[PDB]
Amino acid sequence: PDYDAVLQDIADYVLDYRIDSTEALDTARNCLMDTLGCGLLALRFPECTKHLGPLVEGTLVPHGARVPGTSFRLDPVKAAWDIGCIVRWLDYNDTWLAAEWGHPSDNLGGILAVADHLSQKRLANGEAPLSMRQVLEAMIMAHEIQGVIALENSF
Amino acid sequence: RPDYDAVLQDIADYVLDYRIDSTEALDTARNCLMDTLGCGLLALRFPECTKHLGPLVEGTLVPHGARVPGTSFRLDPVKAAWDIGCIVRWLDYNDTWLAAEWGHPSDNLGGILAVADHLSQKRLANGEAPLSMRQVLEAMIMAHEIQGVIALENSFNRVGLDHVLLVKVASTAVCAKLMGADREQLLAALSHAFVDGQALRTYRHAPNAGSRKSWAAGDATSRGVRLADIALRGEMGIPGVLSAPQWGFYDVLFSHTSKDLATKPEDKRRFSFPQGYGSYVMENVLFKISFPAEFHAQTAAEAAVRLHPLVKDRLQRISRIVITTHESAIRIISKVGPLANPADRDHCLQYMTAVPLIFGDLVAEHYEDAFHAAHPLIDRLREKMEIVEEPRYSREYLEADKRSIANAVEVFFDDGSSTGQVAVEYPLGHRRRRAEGIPLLQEKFKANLATRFPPQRCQRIFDLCSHQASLEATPVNRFMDLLAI
Amino acid sequence: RPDYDAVLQDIADYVLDYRIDSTEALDTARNCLMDTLGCGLLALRFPECTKHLGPLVEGTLVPHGARVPGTSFRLDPVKAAWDIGCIVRWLDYNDTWLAAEWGHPSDNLGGILAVADHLSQKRLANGEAPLSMRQVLEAMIMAHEIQGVIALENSFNRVGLDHVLLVKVASTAVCAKLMGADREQLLAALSHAFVDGQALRTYRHAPNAGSRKSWAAGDATSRGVRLADIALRGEMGIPGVLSAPQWGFYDVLFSHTSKDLATKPEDKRRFSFPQGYGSYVMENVLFKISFPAEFHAQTAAEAAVRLHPLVKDRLQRISRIVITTHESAIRIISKVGPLANPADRDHCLQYMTAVPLIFGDLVAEHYEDAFHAAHPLIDRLREKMEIVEEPRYSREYLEADKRSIANAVEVFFDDGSSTGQVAVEYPLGHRRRRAEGIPLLQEKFKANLATRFPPQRCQRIFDLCSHQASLEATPVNRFMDLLAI
């Protein structure tokens, strides 16, 4: 059996869509800023900070992903947990009101940890690293997938 | 803000206060540990399995990291639990609990082993004493009990959820205990396991079946570790997670039947229990030590091996074969027609009774496609089989006293006579044949050790697992050192 | 203080100055690389092999460490070369050179890959370009040539020494080249390989044979890496290591035959050569791609599978089987009488001729005492087998334009009739059948890859190894990335 159509449409958009919107790229930049400042503010709150860091103190991850405002250096899965945790902790980040409510800047967690770790690994292999343009584009796509499914489907 | 729902309090007070006093529970816990580890070493021969194992970032150094049996990995306990529970379930040779829900409680060994290994290395480095394999075995018993007892009357198959959420629930509780949780931390943890997403079981059913059927359990026991660790970091719990109207587990996930979308009756919209938590599940667990066959047909095949020398001579002159069986076996494994893959012969009671009648044994190569074609007699004997339902066999299947999987076979020749009806009520992995099974289970263990370790090492490993008192006193870290690589 | 012995200078000037542009050499080296790596991956299923692998101290971290294919190990290049050489040789499925000395030049890939992987990574970490796989192919060709050309006319088993010293010398040479050695450092490195100790071959001969016959080569290419590294650290050389009176290699180790402790005539107390170094060995190398049998019997087993449909149902009418063969097969694998283990059957021409004559095939399963006993026709036919030397076959076995390995089989019946004589002079893994052999070599690589990697990784590896120009331009570190875990 073939994949359900919904999954085909997400995949074809993700792999084939060329972003041509100067406004989407400029807003994604301001969204990066806003979301990151939100994450930095959350580090004043111990109920948030008690979740951050490595599962085992003293773990060393080669080319580990960083968490903004901290000294942590982790695998992307945990770094993404921490980053998404701090930028959403105080409920100040961006919002999408539709059939389903949400905060699509939450995906910056997975985006930033994976881009940071991958960039370091490409540098160590002599290749060029990822540019922030590729995170701005990945935020536009993550916003799009979450927010468009949100238009008429309420969970 | 309510108290924690009564189901959670019950799990938490068993886990914290129950004192295990069953020599038999501790003895089959040891046998289960042997059998489960041997299934995991075996799985290291399969690339589809090993592609999941190891650190998420190559070269990761983890102080006092958890070991994965048969590998050189050293991980945090969350990924080590993923890996250990992955391999021990991959080939579906580990222990089985047949109830309202089906499951494999030895799956919870992923979380137990990983957390105990890492905690023991850490306390040893602090000048404290390590944990003992005795504490692993008791964790095994309690996890079996939580998963098996909920399984007794509550079916998640019928609400379209996979059984791995009982792995998650049990692993959370028993890993929170090993980590030192007080009652309030343990309750928070359980509550997060029930608020968590619960996997569908789409990957167990054609035409979408896939290898996730083989690692769902490692993934859930891993998530138990992580959720336990969140509770030990002090995260608040969710007291009404089951009972809350509109938002609670019961209303959202346990109130509708999957086959028809029908709402369940209001009284059936809750977990029901026929007994409390003890050590019943481990004492009564089923081991896969006999012929490779579906469990409802194991006694049938054993009967067909006893009847083999009698009907070896007069195979051609056969007119009728009666297989007296129990109800569940009829619904589940009685198939009439053709079987165009080994998975169909796997679940055909008539096929698993026919082949051992003809040849005197049932091995993995009897289910092969080409082996079927080469023997037309197999299909001819299946035609002459009629499946009779004994009303005591079926009621004794559901009896807590007995938990039988009984089958009787008798073949009538065309001349008018027949072999006596040979009835086997208890398969070789059952509680009631444990004396006879333990040799088989040890043989299977030693075969599985030999696929990963050299002779010297295999003997040292089996020697340690042979001896209850010596094994129980062994530091968990010194046990894991012996199982590494 | 003399110059270096001329043999050493000839090896060095070849290693430093000879340019490799032979299209066929480079294509067969790429097939050699596939076949060797797939052999090693298969060995990871064998604990007697894997018990030797990994760091000497568990948990050691090596920055820019060399990788062992199919494992998660990251080692220094000396231990890495040991493990790679150990695994690719373990099952005796890798390539072969039959001459005055027999050997498996692909054993040197252990030293080549480990050095080239480590050095690419270290060079990347200092902003230097890494090594390319083109360089490992060229190092293989040179290592094949140094070993296989010395083996043309110099027999070391006749002096009672293992042939593995030729692995040490060749691996020393090409690893010193890869490490950047100049002529004086390469000469010193070569001189330390000859002055070094040269293993006996006790472990290859009953009643003392054992599993060091499988890892002697890995041990020798590892030692070559170590001596190359000693030379690059600037250690002075030993110029008359071979020809020094009393203390030199010639007088001490190449001066006596070990059959009779008899001294050689003076003119034969040194190495002899029929040609210089080029790309001859790799172009004419032998692959094991057909039946799993000793090389002297592969054309015998082939000539029998041909004869199988003509006899498949007249087995009790066979009265005389004539096997026309060459002098080396008679001497090494012609055995009458009982065969104790599979090793006997593995090295018994009559067995490897009788089984295919009966079952149209030959696989490892046939070397099983269980299969042997199950069919008494093997020995009935073995007792009917007349072995005859063909003078031509023995001559063409030796001639450098042919390197035949020839077996003609003829089957006679009790009524006086016969099949023809089926002659196969060249096995499938021979240069003269490259066209047909390469399909089989590639399928053999694909199967072996699949015992270790899941399907998409298997596809990436096969696809990359398939394209000469693409593989050649691949950095060694990135090639080794694909083979980890």
Cα angle for residues B237, B242, B245 (degrees, 5° grid) = 110
One-letter amino acid at C361 equals D
Q: How far is A115 from chain C (nearest CA, A)?
A: 20
Taking each continuous run of H as one helix and of E as one strand, the counts in chain C are: 22, 8
Burial C300-328, CB ≥16 within 10 A → b, else e: bbbbbbbbeeebeeeeeebeebbbbbbbb
Cα separation, B317 vs B417, in Å, equals: 11
Does residue A125 sit at the C interface (CB-CB below 8 Å)? yes
Cα angle for residues C178, C179, C180 (degrees, 5° grid) = 85
Q: How far is C125 from chain A (nearest CA, A)?
A: 7
Cα separation, C29 vs C137, in Å, equals: 6
How far the first Cα of chain C sits from its last, in Å, is 51
Place of tokens 């050691």: C60
Cα separation, B354 vs B323, in Å, equals: 11
Residues 6+ apart with CB under 8 A from B59: A62, C61, C74
Residue B34, CB-side half-sphere exposure with 13 Å CA sphere: 30
Q: Which of residues 447-466 of C touch B (CB under 8 A)?
A: 450-454, 457
**B51/C457 touch (CB, cutoff 8 Å), yes or no:** yes
Residue B102, strand partner residues = B98
Strands B318-325, B385-389: pairing is parallel
- B47 contacts in chain C (CB < 8 Å): 450-454
Collapsed DSSP state (helix, strand, coil) of residue A10 = helix
- A126 contacts in chain C (CB < 8 Å): 124, 129-130
How far the first Cα of chain B sits from its last, in Å, is 50
CB C153 within 8 A of CB C267: no
**A117/B57 touch (CB, cutoff 8 Å), yes or no:** yes
Cα separation, B24 vs C22, in Å, equals: 72
CB C186 within 8 A of CB C16: yes
Collapsed DSSP state (helix, strand, coil) of residue C116 = helix
* Structure tokens, C218: 């890995």
Collapsed DSSP state (helix, strand, coil) of residue B418 = strand
Collapsed DSSP state (helix, strand, coil) of residue B476 = helix
Does residue C59 sit at the B interface (CB-CB below 8 Å)? yes
CB B196 within 8 A of CB B223: yes
* Structure tokens, C478: 């990135």
Place of tokens 């030199």: C248
**DSSP percent split of chain B into helix, strand, coil, nearest 5:** 55, 10, 35
Cα separation, B197 vs B252, in Å, equals: 11
Cα separation, C4 vs C242, in Å, equals: 9
Q: Give yes or no for a cis peptide into A68 (omega within 30° of 0).
A: no
Dihedrals phi, psi of B276, to nearest 5 degrees: -85, -165
- Resolution in angstroms comes to 2.4
Give one DSSP letter per residue of A44-105, joined into a string.
T-HHHHTT-S-SSTT-B-TTPEE-TTS--EE-HHHHHHHHHHHHHHTS-S--B-SSS-B-GG
CB B33 within 8 A of CB B84: no
CB C116 within 8 A of CB C72: no
Residue B92, strand partner residues = none
Collapsed DSSP state (helix, strand, coil) of residue A125 = coil
Place of tokens 């003809």: B358
Nearest Cα neighbor of C471 from C178, C120, C134 is C134
- B65 contacts in chain A (CB < 8 Å): 56
Collapsed DSSP state (helix, strand, coil) of residue B319 = strand
Nearest Cα neighbor of C142 from C224, C218, C245 is C224
Give one DSSP letter per residue of C66-115, joined into a string.
EEPTTS--EE-HHHHHHHHHHHHHTTS-S-BB-SSS-B-GGGGHHHHHHH
**B60/A61 touch (CB, cutoff 8 Å), yes or no:** yes
Collapsed DSSP state (helix, strand, coil) of residue C409 = strand
Cα separation, C115 vs C135, in Å, equals: 11
Place of tokens 């003078």: C391
Residues 6+ apart with CB under 8 A from C242: C5, C7, C8, C194, C248, C249, C250, C270, C271
Residues 6+ apart with CB under 8 A from C259: C158
Strands B66-67, B74-75: pairing is antiparallel
| Helix ranges (DSSP H) in C90-205 | 109-125, 133-150, 165-178, 183-195
Cα separation, A10 vs A144, in Å, equals: 10
- B230 contacts in chain A (CB < 8 Å): 51
| Helix ranges (DSSP H) in B44-163 | 47-50, 77-90, 109-125, 133-153
Residues 6+ apart with CB under 8 A from B127: none
Dihedrals phi, psi of B278, to nearest 5 degrees: -135, -115
In this structure, the number of other CB atoms found within 10 A of the CB of residue A47 comes to: 11
Cα separation, C460 vs C449, in Å, equals: 11
* Structure tokens, B79: 């990924």
Cα separation, B284 vs B19, in Å, equals: 18
Collapsed DSSP state (helix, strand, coil) of residue B213 = helix
CB B409 within 8 A of CB B393: no
Nearest-Cα residue of chain C relative to residue B48: C454
In this structure, the number of other CB atoms found within 10 A of the CB of residue B51 comes to: 16
Strands (E) across B317-433 are located at 318-325, 385-389, 407-413, 422-424
- A125 contacts in chain C (CB < 8 Å): 124, 477-478
At C225, which helix (H) or strand (E)? helix C212-232
Cα separation, B290 vs C283, in Å, equals: 53
Q: Residue ranges of the domains in chain C? A: 1-288+429-485, 289-428
In this structure, the number of other CB atoms found within 10 A of the CB of residue A151 comes to: 10
* Structure tokens, B97: 């609990």
**A1/B208 touch (CB, cutoff 8 Å), yes or no:** yes
Residues 6+ apart with CB under 8 A from C459: none
Residue C74, strand partner residues = C67
* Structure tokens, C407: 């077996």
Cα separation, C171 vs C112, in Å, equals: 7
User: Helix crossing, C23-43 with C77-89: angle to 10°?
Assistant: 90
Cα separation, C160 vs C202, in Å, equals: 8
Does residue A4 sit at the B interface (CB-CB below 8 Å)? no
Residue B98, strand partner residues = B102
Which of A61, A85, A116 is the best mutation test for B, with the most CBs of B within 10 A? Answer: A61
Residues 6+ apart with CB under 8 A from C40: C69, C70, C84, C87, C88, C90
Q: C224: exposed, middle or buried (C-beta count within 10 Å: 0-12, 13-18, 19+)?
A: buried
Q: A84: exposed, middle or buried (C-beta count within 10 Å: 0-12, 13-18, 19+)?
A: buried
CB C18 within 8 A of CB C140: no
DSSP structure class, residue B426: S
Residues 6+ apart with CB under 8 A from B482: B457, B460, B461, B464
CB C283 within 8 A of CB C31: no
Q: A16: exposed, middle or buried (C-beta count within 10 Å: 0-12, 13-18, 19+)?
A: exposed
DSSP structure class, residue B72: -
Place of tokens 């050790």: B449
Nearest Cα neighbor of C77 from C50, C116, C124, C34 is C116
Q: C389: exposed, middle or buried (C-beta count within 10 Å: 0-12, 13-18, 19+)?
A: middle
What's chain C's Rg over C-alpha atoms? 23
CB B462 within 8 A of CB B445: yes
Q: Which strands make up the sheet holding B385-389, listed edge to edge?
A: B385-389, B318-325, B407-413, B422-424
Cα separation, B345 vs B339, in Å, equals: 6
**B450/C54 touch (CB, cutoff 8 Å), yes or no:** no
* Structure tokens, C20: 């490799």
**B233/A50 touch (CB, cutoff 8 Å), yes or no:** yes
Max intra-chain CA distance, chain A: 51
CB B64 within 8 A of CB B125: yes
Collapsed DSSP state (helix, strand, coil) of residue B75 = strand
CB C428 within 8 A of CB C441: no
Nearest Cα neighbor of B192 from B233, B156, B238, B150 is B238
Mapping DSSP onto H, E and C, the string for C246-284 reads CCCHHHHHCCEECCCCEECCHHHCCCCCCCCCCCHHHHC
Nearest Cα neighbor of C103 from C255, C316, C231, C286 is C286
* Structure tokens, C177: 């080249």
Cα separation, A87 vs A105, in Å, equals: 8
One-letter amino acid at C127 equals G
* Structure tokens, C326: 């060459």
Burial C36-46, CB ≥16 within 10 A → b, else e: bbbbbbbbbbb
Dihedrals phi, psi of C423, to nearest 5 degrees: -105, 125
Nearest-Cα residue of chain C relative to residue A125: C124
Instruction: Tell me the residue length of chain B.
Output: 485
- B59 contacts in chain A (CB < 8 Å): 62
Nearest-Cα residue of chain A relative to residue B252: A155
Place of tokens 């903004």: A68
| Helix ranges (DSSP H) in C316-405 | 327-333, 342-346, 349-359, 369-374, 377-383, 391-398
Collapsed DSSP state (helix, strand, coil) of residue B147 = helix
Cα separation, A56 vs A58, in Å, equals: 6
Nearest to B63 among A51, A58, A77 (CB): A58
Cα separation, B173 vs B191, in Å, equals: 10
Q: How far is CA B62 from CA B59, B66, B78, B224, B484, in A?
A: 10, 8, 12, 20, 16
Nearest to B76 among A1, A56, A117 (CB): A56
Cα separation, B153 vs B271, in Å, equals: 8
**B452/C47 touch (CB, cutoff 8 Å), yes or no:** yes
Q: How far is CA B481 from CA B20, B35, B81, in A?
A: 27, 18, 16
Q: How far is C86 from chain B (nearest CA, A)?
A: 16
* Structure tokens, C378: 């093997």
- CB contacts < 8 A, A to B, total 46
Residue B423, strand partner residues = B408
